[PDB]
């Protein structure tokens, strides 16, 4: 195979890297030829920091108001360290 390559490249970042091996019908496939039990955590085995609509026992997938450890701000040390206390 020669000429310009639209073949997926790891170094190139973007759409190409996505879903490797989960895709059939790829140009590659032809060339190849030649989890939790319950969505909601156990009620007894968890206690939620904020009850009510702040509950995080159920796993909502998608774009959902939860925040990774990567993301900083709003809570944690940004609410906890502002005022001195003994």
Measured from the Cβ of residue 68, the count of other Cβ atoms closer than 10 Å reads 6
Q: Is 9 in the site for another protein (CB under 8 A)?
A: yes
Q: Could you give the CA distance from residue 42 to residue 24 in angstroms, rounded to a whole number? A: 37
Q: Which one-letter DSSP state was computed for residue 41?
A: P
- Residue 26 structure tokens: 């790829």
What residues between 45 and 84 interact with another protein by CB under 8 A? 49-55, 57-68, 70-84
Q: Cβ closer to another protein: 45 or 86?
A: 86
Residues that bind another protein (CB under 8 A): 1-7, 9, 11-16, 18-20, 22-27, 30-31, 33-35, 38-40, 49-55, 57-68, 70-86
């Amino acid at each position: 195979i020669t000429g310009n390559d639209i073949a997926p490249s790891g170094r190139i970042t973007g759409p190409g890297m996505l879903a490797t091996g989960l895709i059939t019908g790829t140009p590659e496939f032809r060339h190849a030829a030649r989890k939790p039990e319950l969505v909601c955590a156990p009620r007894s085995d968890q206690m939620d920091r904020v009850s009510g609509e702040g509950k995080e026992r159920c796993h909502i997938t998608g774009d959902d108001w939860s925040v990774n450890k990567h993301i900083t701000g709003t809570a944690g040390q940004w609410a906890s360290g502002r005022n001195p206390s003994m």
